Amino acid sequence: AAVCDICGKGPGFGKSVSHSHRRTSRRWNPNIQPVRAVTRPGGNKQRINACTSCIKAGKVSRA
RNA sequence: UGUCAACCGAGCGUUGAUCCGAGGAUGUCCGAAUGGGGAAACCCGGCACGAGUGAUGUCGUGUCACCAGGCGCUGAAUAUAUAGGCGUCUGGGGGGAACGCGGGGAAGUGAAACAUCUCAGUACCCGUAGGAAGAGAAAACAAAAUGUGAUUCCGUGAGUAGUGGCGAGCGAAAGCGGAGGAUGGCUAAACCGUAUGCAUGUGAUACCGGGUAGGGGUUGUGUGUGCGGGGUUGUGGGACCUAUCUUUCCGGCUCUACCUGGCUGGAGGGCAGUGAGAAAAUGUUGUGGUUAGCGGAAAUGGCUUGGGAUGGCCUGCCGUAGACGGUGAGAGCCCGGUACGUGAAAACCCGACGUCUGUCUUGAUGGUGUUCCCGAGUAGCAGCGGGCCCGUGGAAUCUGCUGUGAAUCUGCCGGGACCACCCGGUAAGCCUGAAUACUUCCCAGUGACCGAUAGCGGAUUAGUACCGUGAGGGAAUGGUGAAAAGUACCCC
RNA sequence: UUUUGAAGAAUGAGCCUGCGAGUCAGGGACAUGUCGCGAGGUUAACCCGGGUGGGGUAGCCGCAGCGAAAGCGAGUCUGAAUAGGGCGUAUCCACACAAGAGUGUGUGGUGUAGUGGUGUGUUCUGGACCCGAAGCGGAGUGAUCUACCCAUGGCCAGGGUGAAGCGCGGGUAAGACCGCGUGGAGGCCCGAACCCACUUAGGUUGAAGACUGAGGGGAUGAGCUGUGGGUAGGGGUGAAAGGCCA
RNA sequence: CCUGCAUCCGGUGAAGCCGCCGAGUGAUCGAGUGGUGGAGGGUGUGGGAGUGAGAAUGCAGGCAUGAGUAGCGAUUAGGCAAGUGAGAACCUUGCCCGCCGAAAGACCAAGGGUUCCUGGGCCAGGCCAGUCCGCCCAGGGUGAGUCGGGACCUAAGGCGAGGCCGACAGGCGUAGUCGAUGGACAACGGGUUGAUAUUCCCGUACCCGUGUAUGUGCGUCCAUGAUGGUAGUCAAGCGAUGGGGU
RNA sequence: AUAUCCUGAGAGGUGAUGCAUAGCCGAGUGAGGCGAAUUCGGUGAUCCUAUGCUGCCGAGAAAAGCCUCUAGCGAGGACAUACACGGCCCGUACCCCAAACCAACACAGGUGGUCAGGUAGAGAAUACUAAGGCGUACGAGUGAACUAUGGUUAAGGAACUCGG
RNA sequence: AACCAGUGAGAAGCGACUGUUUACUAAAAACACAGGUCCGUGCGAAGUCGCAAGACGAUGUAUACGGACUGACGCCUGCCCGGUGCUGGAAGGUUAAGAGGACCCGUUAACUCCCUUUGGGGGUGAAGCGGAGAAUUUAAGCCCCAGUAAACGGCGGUGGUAACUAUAACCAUCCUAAGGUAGCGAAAUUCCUUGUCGGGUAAGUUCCGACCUGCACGAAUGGCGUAACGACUUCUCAACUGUCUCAACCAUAGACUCGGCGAAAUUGCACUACGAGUAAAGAUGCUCGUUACGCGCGGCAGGACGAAAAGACCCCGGGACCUUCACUACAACUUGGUAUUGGUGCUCGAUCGUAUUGGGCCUCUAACCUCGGACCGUAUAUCCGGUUCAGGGACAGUGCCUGGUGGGUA
RNA sequence: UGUAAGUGCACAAGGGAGCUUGACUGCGAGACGGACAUGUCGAGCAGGGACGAAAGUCGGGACUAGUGAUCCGGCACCUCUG
Ligand SMILES: [Mg+2]
Ligand SMILES: [Mg+2]
Ligand SMILES: [Mg+2]
Ligand SMILES: [Mg+2]
Ligand SMILES: [Mg+2]
Ligand SMILES: [Mg+2]
Ligand SMILES: [Mg+2]
Ligand SMILES: [Mg+2]
Ligand SMILES: [Mg+2]
Ligand SMILES: [Mg+2]
Ligand SMILES: [Mg+2]
Ligand SMILES: [Mg+2]
Ligand SMILES: [Mg+2]
Ligand SMILES: [Mg+2]
Ligand SMILES: [Mg+2]
Ligand SMILES: [Mg+2]
Ligand SMILES: [Mg+2]
Ligand SMILES: [Mg+2]
Ligand SMILES: [Mg+2]
Ligand SMILES: [Mg+2]
Ligand SMILES: [Mg+2]
Ligand SMILES: [Mg+2]
Ligand SMILES: [Mg+2]
Ligand SMILES: [Mg+2]
Ligand SMILES: [Mg+2]
Ligand SMILES: [Mg+2]
Ligand SMILES: [Mg+2]
Ligand SMILES: [Mg+2]
Ligand SMILES: [Mg+2]
Ligand SMILES: [Mg+2]
Ligand SMILES: [Mg+2]
Ligand SMILES: [Mg+2]
Ligand SMILES: [Mg+2]
Ligand SMILES: [Mg+2]
Ligand SMILES: [Mg+2]
Ligand SMILES: [Mg+2]
Ligand SMILES: [Mg+2]
Ligand SMILES: [Mg+2]
Ligand SMILES: [Mg+2]
Ligand SMILES: [Mg+2]
Ligand SMILES: [Mg+2]
Ligand SMILES: [Mg+2]
Ligand SMILES: [Mg+2]
Ligand SMILES: [Mg+2]
Ligand SMILES: [Mg+2]
Ligand SMILES: [Mg+2]
Ligand SMILES: [Mg+2]
Ligand SMILES: [Mg+2]
Ligand SMILES: [Mg+2]
Ligand SMILES: [Mg+2]
Ligand SMILES: [Mg+2]
Ligand SMILES: [Mg+2]
Ligand SMILES: [Mg+2]
Ligand SMILES: [Mg+2]
Ligand SMILES: [Mg+2]
Ligand SMILES: [Mg+2]
Ligand SMILES: [Mg+2]
Ligand SMILES: [Mg+2]
Ligand SMILES: [Mg+2]
Ligand SMILES: [Mg+2]
Ligand SMILES: [Mg+2]
Ligand SMILES: [Mg+2]
Ligand SMILES: [Mg+2]
Ligand SMILES: [Mg+2]
Ligand SMILES: [Mg+2]
Ligand SMILES: [Mg+2]
Ligand SMILES: [Mg+2]
Ligand SMILES: [Mg+2]
Ligand SMILES: [Mg+2]
Ligand SMILES: [Mg+2]
Ligand SMILES: [Mg+2]
Ligand SMILES: [Mg+2]
Ligand SMILES: [Mg+2]
Ligand SMILES: [Mg+2]
Ligand SMILES: [Mg+2]
Ligand SMILES: [Mg+2]
Ligand SMILES: [Mg+2]
Ligand SMILES: [Mg+2]
Ligand SMILES: [Mg+2]
Ligand SMILES: [Mg+2]
Ligand SMILES: [Mg+2]
Ligand SMILES: [Mg+2]
Ligand SMILES: [Mg+2]
Ligand SMILES: [Mg+2]
Ligand SMILES: [Mg+2]
Ligand SMILES: [Mg+2]
Ligand SMILES: [Mg+2]
Ligand SMILES: [Mg+2]
Ligand SMILES: [Mg+2]
Ligand SMILES: [Mg+2]
Ligand SMILES: [Mg+2]
Ligand SMILES: [Mg+2]
Ligand SMILES: [Mg+2]
Ligand SMILES: [Mg+2]
Ligand SMILES: [Mg+2]
Ligand SMILES: [Mg+2]
Ligand SMILES: [Mg+2]
Ligand SMILES: [Mg+2]
Ligand SMILES: [Mg+2]
Ligand SMILES: [Mg+2]
Ligand SMILES: [Mg+2]
Ligand SMILES: [Mg+2]
Ligand SMILES: [Mg+2]
Ligand SMILES: [Mg+2]
Ligand SMILES: [Mg+2]
Ligand SMILES: [Mg+2]
Ligand SMILES: [Mg+2]
Ligand SMILES: [Mg+2]
Ligand SMILES: [Mg+2]
Ligand SMILES: [Mg+2]
Ligand SMILES: [Mg+2]
Ligand SMILES: [Mg+2]
Ligand SMILES: [Mg+2]
Ligand SMILES: [Mg+2]
Ligand SMILES: [Mg+2]
Ligand SMILES: [Mg+2]
Ligand SMILES: [Mg+2]
Ligand SMILES: [Mg+2]
Ligand SMILES: [Mg+2]
Ligand SMILES: [Mg+2]
Ligand SMILES: [Mg+2]
Ligand SMILES: [Mg+2]
Ligand SMILES: [Mg+2]
Ligand SMILES: [Mg+2]
Ligand SMILES: [Mg+2]
Ligand SMILES: [Mg+2]
Ligand SMILES: [Mg+2]
Ligand SMILES: [Mg+2]
Ligand SMILES: [Mg+2]
Ligand SMILES: [Mg+2]
Ligand SMILES: [Mg+2]
Ligand SMILES: [Mg+2]
Ligand SMILES: [Mg+2]
Ligand SMILES: [Mg+2]
Ligand SMILES: [Mg+2]
Ligand SMILES: [Mg+2]
Ligand SMILES: [Mg+2]
Ligand SMILES: [Mg+2]
Ligand SMILES: [Mg+2]
Ligand SMILES: [Mg+2]
Ligand SMILES: [Mg+2]
Ligand SMILES: [Mg+2]
Ligand SMILES: [Mg+2]
Ligand SMILES: [Mg+2]
Ligand SMILES: [Mg+2]
Ligand SMILES: [Mg+2]
Ligand SMILES: [Mg+2]
Ligand SMILES: [Mg+2]
Ligand SMILES: [Mg+2]
Ligand SMILES: [Mg+2]
Ligand SMILES: [Mg+2]
Ligand SMILES: [Mg+2]
Ligand SMILES: [Mg+2]
Ligand SMILES: [Mg+2]
Ligand SMILES: [Mg+2]
Ligand SMILES: [Mg+2]
Ligand SMILES: [Mg+2]
Ligand SMILES: [Mg+2]
Ligand SMILES: [Mg+2]
Ligand SMILES: [Mg+2]
Ligand SMILES: [Mg+2]
Ligand SMILES: [Mg+2]
Ligand SMILES: [Mg+2]
Ligand SMILES: [Mg+2]
Ligand SMILES: [Mg+2]
Ligand SMILES: [Mg+2]
Ligand SMILES: [Mg+2]
Ligand SMILES: [Mg+2]
Ligand SMILES: [Mg+2]
Ligand SMILES: [Mg+2]
Ligand SMILES: [Mg+2]
Ligand SMILES: [Mg+2]
Ligand SMILES: [Mg+2]
Ligand SMILES: [Mg+2]
Ligand SMILES: [Mg+2]
Ligand SMILES: [Mg+2]
Ligand SMILES: [Mg+2]
Ligand SMILES: [Mg+2]
Ligand SMILES: [Mg+2]
Ligand SMILES: [Mg+2]
Ligand SMILES: [Mg+2]
Ligand SMILES: [Mg+2]
Ligand SMILES: [Mg+2]
Ligand SMILES: [Mg+2]
Ligand SMILES: [Mg+2]
Ligand SMILES: [Mg+2]
Ligand SMILES: [Zn+2]
């Protein structure tokens, strides 16, 4: 739950602000889920972490 | 025949010692440690080739990690195939004082308190290479001037325009003047060829510019990929037809033989070359400098005090050399050397002079109307955060994440919301030296800087003794005199 | 020294020789002397000179001010108002006009002085006269004593107390129960080593940075101890006292 | 005090120190004189100061009183004759007396590294003097097929090829290899020098390996046998990285 | 069935015509030579049989080695005797209930384990003692008070002290 | 016969016993201890450490495990559900993000009047581009209603009503939830207190047994007893003794002289009297007066505000830790939307059949999930990966925004 | 004699009656006391009003208490900017 193995999108770091205008540390992590990639026509897939961006763009096929 | 620091015994050298300059071998063990093991410098092996004993026991020289990337073989449950397994080559594991790039990232303290702020993007950490790095060829400014023309670094522009519990504080840009010259080059798209596959075929009147004609595969027609031409831009450009001008020879092809228009090979003549624009090697110069050395001028002058003249008085000489040190007391002419001249076996790097490599000349020049192209989850939009003076405020621009999601030249984006008219430009791919930053080391120089409680903690046994089981802390100790001639000898 | 008030019984001083304290940086600011120039002064960054010298007009202040502005100008803003007011035209004298509500309104003159270096007092930003804590964060180091647990050994001198069970003689129909011999279960009892620390006297510039002399509790267990291992600081551990962590 | 400039002094004695004599309204001065010394100084006028001490329970070094006062670190206690030598209650020899004796004795592991022996001396140390020493100097000294460890095996635990997770840094744990306080494993008595002893010697034992010779002696090539009975295997001898006992 | 096997204390023979010793001679920092008897009883273990046996519950390491089995290799190997050989690396002095270790010291503390004689004694307590080792590092004198550790004391016995 | 070698009894209080604790002032009435009750846990559990895998719980499965209060054994364990938590009913009101676009304006196409010639100067209006943007939708929390005291908690005063004196020993007044059941009581609780009564010696503010006037005893922060036990606290009795009237004597190690070595704290100065005075209010050091040869040794300690640690007690200023309905945040938990995210069916609505795009429910498998079984990588593997079989399944988990609880942390 | 006290008012500022909103706009010569900013009075000018024939008075209440800076923001208008 860190980075997409394909596009390598790492998490970004920022500062969270309360309604009292006081600052504090917080982190944002890109949406990535475990899916079996469709790359070989042979009909075999392997467990690889992927990101919604790559999945929806189809860089790893759906089948 | 190094040195602390005398002393003895031993020896070499004119047949060139010692010394210094360049290159070359050996180089026990640990230390990324990598034959295996482990509490640093200590224990135990395999394999091959040699040495030794009547044979084991023994001994010498090689070789015996891991990971990643190529290449070859092999193909499990399981069939296609993969994972996995073997053989062989190429690379990497650590260290380094400062200098860079991208991230993470704190608390003391001011506001006479303090949450926002500031301290500060500081200390520290992480991943990273170099001798420098990064950045870089406008989707840039400005405003009606017919302006500038890549980037970087300094001085102004000013403590102003702004911002802030409008407190404490924080802080630009444009333009202008300087250092440098390369206002440089590459790459995917529009279309033909070629190894292919996936396909399907009316498998025959379609593939080839016209005419004579032979046939049914340069597949008849589509798709994705590797390989060579033609193109690289803003007054838009590039691909197709249509006229004009056309600065070597020959061959094979445009299905085929014959004329017309195109594709490709073999030979002049230019073009550059270690180069960012393509890469590899091989044949002949600079008293270019550097790593040592060598030459190098003139008073034993006289008189005086003296232990000692390098002190005082009087006479000389050199000066392309009166910088600086030593010598028994302040030395141009005593010594070391200074001005100046020379000077290298080997090696270094620079520059210049020579085989070889490769694009183009099958090609270039100025026009025309039509059909296709100009960098995809991108630009923009909505939500949540950063840093620009802008501390969400009307919020421009850049950027991180999540959803939605566009077009190809009367297209698109920019001139601090936004609309209309004007003006500039062509992002979503990649390289690019010169102007700049720094010294752990070496060479040469300087001090209205310190002289032993000062000066680096360290002028001597120095990061030693010592303290602490640890990170770590951290001490004080120079002057005899010209030479030791360091007081023979006698006496208590 | 600090005190309104002290020779003090308010503090500092054993003696001696050394070491120890209003400086620096910036074209900063105000003020004050000093030198050139004079309606100008004035150079940065950067070039050429073993050298302090010579170039370098990019910049900054006075030269006109008023008004938030479109602007205007010896005037200007407020304003319906030459109608009074706010700011400015260096200052002055003289000449005329008004009231003499103190002064103002119009003409002519002498005519204005600022700017660069530098000495000195203060001030701005750097810790800015000298020295002086309890505490915070980041990064690292310790469970060899002390707490707990884990694997593996050793340790407890002597002497008493006698459950179940068992066999025999009684009781019963069988028992419970009644006596007789064996057994040593006991977080049982008295008492060594070891371990603990209750009272008491000494020590207190001690022999010892927490002991000694007399007495005091366990001693087969929640026992004692050796060997090697694990537990890291807003945390560990803790038969729980706000203890321990060299 | 250091410096630019111009001057003067100095082995016929420059700088500090200790006196005498004097001098200015002050911080002081003397080119006026005496002893010590041996190597650089003064005046005039400019520029720059780490430029002037008595106190902060200041710091480095040296030294005052209490002071020739307390103590000289237990629960046993010495005495005598002789010797050595300059020195003897503290050293050597001999004779009495006392103390300890679940230790105040004889040993192992951990712990230190030359404290062990021989020879030399007694300015450093021993709480006093020392001929003595756990002071130092110079030399010498440590002997394993069988004792403790390694080459044999394992635990609580540590490392960790692959791998999982994690923004990076990093946390986990498989196969394996490390880790005695355990298991198995083969020697005892006596003698010996100034220091070594299950180690050397004497006497007698035990456990693994290699070579040669000899004797039992069995097969490969013949072939009986048992068979499942022509033919195909075979039970010799080794025997596990595997199974099962211990 | 004391069948058969295993184990196995203790006893007995061998090791040993050897070694050592009480003692006798000369000989002294000491060495040399010679060298007797060595039978029977009592007491009695914390040591052996013993990983035994009997009770109890809180219910009690692994690997290696050894034996065996085949799988599998296999034509030389097994046994016995004799002769002649090899058997690897580190630890090895001295100090150990302390003047040599832990405590700043030549310290009134601590430090795991093994040896345990005689007499009285229940004893590994207590008293004197053998083997064995010590007189441990400032001394000599002196009826002061006072201090501290002991010893004794008429009659009352707790009347002091907050408190036997 | 030396040495060695337990005083005993009678009560009360507290605790059931043996045990453990503040190294270095406190060993207890403190702590735990076996008994019980309640709460929570359906199994890669809850609870943990760890942002994650994973590990413990357990190589176990409610006749167990985690949390809480109590403490052997005997007789027992009263009333109250308003407030706050917890478990249920959310059947209504309220509101976040997101969907949604009533109306409005800016903008110039087109224009509405003069004014020219080739849309502005004095208002209408299309599209596109933008802005605030309203009504409708929502889920949680909050308000509403029941249960729970071995959950945190509370359990009063007021008046009247006996045969002579004594008071309430029944009824009603306010309130809320009721206004102390058993048991005990001048106690480890009691200020007025040495309360009153009986025991104890001559004397008893201690002690023992009772009296109820319980400021301010009380039954799971338990009450009253209780065999045995306690280096726990208080009192009484016999024996004893130098603890006393009342002290005396003897020995050891110092204290003392002699010999040797040789110590520390402090220190402004010194040929450092006293009586009465004088002052920063207590004088060796000042005024008047009295006394007093110089220098030592052994003894005693009133003074020299003697030595020790920049006073702990007080205040000022600044820290640290702690508590909560003080403020502001965070972790964690929890609610919806949205992406991951698929197909077919029933059922509810805003331009009784006609149009509305979002809710509720049931199904199917391919996404996805399972510390389920069997095989292979594999000689040794409870790791890991792959194939297959078997179950869940468009949920859950996880990204982004958001509403709530939140002394667990800052 | 509205609201406490004092100072005043018998001429009125006590009461009664008719009309009317000067409880205006643009200004202000000078003084009052104050460390600072806050606080107090005022003659007189112009516009356009009120009362009164006129002379004349009116910039709230016989007098002294009935209140609050800075910053930020809202509303109307403006011959400012853009
Ligand atoms: Mg990731
Ligand atoms: Mg950041
Ligand atoms: Mg912050
Ligand atoms: Mg060399
Ligand atoms: Mg070599
Ligand atoms: Mg290695
Ligand atoms: Mg290694
Ligand atoms: Mg590779
Ligand atoms: Mg296949
Ligand atoms: Mg590196
Ligand atoms: Mg403050
Ligand atoms: Mg503050
Ligand atoms: Mg900043
Ligand atoms: Mg480089
Ligand atoms: Mg660039
Ligand atoms: Mg770029
Ligand atoms: Mg600027
Ligand atoms: Mg400031
Ligand atoms: Mg091309
Ligand atoms: Mg191209
Ligand atoms: Mg001379
Ligand atoms: Mg001369
Ligand atoms: Mg010179
Ligand atoms: Mg010389
Ligand atoms: Mg010189
Ligand atoms: Mg020379
Ligand atoms: Mg902002
Ligand atoms: Mg904004
Ligand atoms: Mg604009
Ligand atoms: Mg243009
Ligand atoms: Mg472009
Ligand atoms: Mg540069
Ligand atoms: Mg000196
Ligand atoms: Mg250390
Ligand atoms: Mg002062
Ligand atoms: Mg004073
Ligand atoms: Mg004063
Ligand atoms: Mg005074
Ligand atoms: Mg005094
Ligand atoms: Mg004082
Ligand atoms: Mg004082
Ligand atoms: Mg004071
Ligand atoms: Mg001093
Ligand atoms: Mg001192
Ligand atoms: Mg200033
Ligand atoms: Mg000035
Ligand atoms: Mg001047
Ligand atoms: Mg005026
Ligand atoms: Mg800290
Ligand atoms: Mg550790
Ligand atoms: Mg029984
Ligand atoms: Mg018994
Ligand atoms: Mg007893
Ligand atoms: Mg003592
Ligand atoms: Mg200490
Ligand atoms: Mg004691
Ligand atoms: Mg004791
Ligand atoms: Mg006693
Ligand atoms: Mg005892
Ligand atoms: Mg007792
Ligand atoms: Mg007991
Ligand atoms: Mg016990
Ligand atoms: Mg550690
Ligand atoms: Mg407590
Ligand atoms: Mg401690
Ligand atoms: Mg000088
Ligand atoms: Mg001279
Ligand atoms: Mg001289
Ligand atoms: Mg002289
Ligand atoms: Mg001299
Ligand atoms: Mg001068
Ligand atoms: Mg001067
Ligand atoms: Mg200066
Ligand atoms: Mg100074
Ligand atoms: Mg001084
Ligand atoms: Mg000192
Ligand atoms: Mg003293
Ligand atoms: Mg004394
Ligand atoms: Mg004494
Ligand atoms: Mg002693
Ligand atoms: Mg003697
Ligand atoms: Mg004894
Ligand atoms: Mg004994
Ligand atoms: Mg003993
Ligand atoms: Mg040891
Ligand atoms: Mg050792
Ligand atoms: Mg010795
Ligand atoms: Mg000697
Ligand atoms: Mg000596
Ligand atoms: Mg000494
Ligand atoms: Mg020696
Ligand atoms: Mg050996
Ligand atoms: Mg492991
Ligand atoms: Mg690895
Ligand atoms: Mg691991
Ligand atoms: Mg190991
Ligand atoms: Mg071991
Ligand atoms: Mg031995
Ligand atoms: Mg026995
Ligand atoms: Mg051998
Ligand atoms: Mg060895
Ligand atoms: Mg030895
Ligand atoms: Mg030793
Ligand atoms: Mg030793
Ligand atoms: Mg010992
Ligand atoms: Mg020591
Ligand atoms: Mg000692
Ligand atoms: Mg000791
Ligand atoms: Mg011990
Ligand atoms: Mg014993
Ligand atoms: Mg004795
Ligand atoms: Mg002895
Ligand atoms: Mg005494
Ligand atoms: Mg006594
Ligand atoms: Mg008597
Ligand atoms: Mg008596
Ligand atoms: Mg009394
Ligand atoms: Mg009493
Ligand atoms: Mg009670
Ligand atoms: Mg007890
Ligand atoms: Mg306890
Ligand atoms: Mg404790
Ligand atoms: Mg204590
Ligand atoms: Mg203690
Ligand atoms: Mg205590
Ligand atoms: Mg206790
Ligand atoms: Mg107790
Ligand atoms: Mg307890
Ligand atoms: Mg109960
Ligand atoms: Mg229980
Ligand atoms: Mg319960
Ligand atoms: Mg769980
Ligand atoms: Mg409970
Ligand atoms: Mg209780
Ligand atoms: Mg209790
Ligand atoms: Mg209720
Ligand atoms: Mg309720
Ligand atoms: Mg309530
Ligand atoms: Mg909407
Ligand atoms: Mg609720
Ligand atoms: Mg309610
Ligand atoms: Mg009572
Ligand atoms: Mg009671
Ligand atoms: Mg009471
Ligand atoms: Mg009382
Ligand atoms: Mg009483
Ligand atoms: Mg009493
Ligand atoms: Mg109470
Ligand atoms: Mg309760
Ligand atoms: Mg209850
Ligand atoms: Mg009781
Ligand atoms: Mg009595
Ligand atoms: Mg008596
Ligand atoms: Mg007496
Ligand atoms: Mg006597
Ligand atoms: Mg004595
Ligand atoms: Mg004494
Ligand atoms: Mg004495
Ligand atoms: Mg002495
Ligand atoms: Mg003092
Ligand atoms: Mg007085
Ligand atoms: Mg007095
Ligand atoms: Mg006083
Ligand atoms: Mg006096
Ligand atoms: Mg006095
Ligand atoms: Mg006097
Ligand atoms: Mg007088
Ligand atoms: Mg007299
Ligand atoms: Mg006193
Ligand atoms: Mg005092
Ligand atoms: Mg204090
Ligand atoms: Mg305070
Ligand atoms: Mg804290
Ligand atoms: Mg959503
Ligand atoms: Mg979703
Ligand atoms: Mg989507
Ligand atoms: Mg709160
Ligand atoms: Mg807190
Ligand atoms: Mg009236
Ligand atoms: Mg008004
Ligand atoms: Mg005025
Ligand atoms: Mg008027
Ligand atoms: Mg007026
Ligand atoms: Mg008025
Ligand atoms: Mg009126
Ligand atoms: Mg403010
Ligand atoms: Zn991706």
CA-nearest of A63, A61, A12, A3 to A32 is A3
Q: Which residues 1-60 on A are within 7 A of strand D at the CB atom?
A: 1-3, 10-11, 27, 29, 49
In contact, A14 and A6? CB cutoff 8 Å: no
Residue A32: phi and psi, rounded to 5, are -135, 140
Give the span between the Cα atoms of A25 and A11, in whole angstroms.
14
A45 CA to F89 C1' distance (Å):
52
Q: Kindly list the distances between the CA atom of residue A49 and the CA atoms of A6, A19, A20, A32, A33, in Å, as whole numbers in the listed order.
A: 9, 36, 39, 7, 6
A23 CB less than 7 Å from any atom of strand B? yes
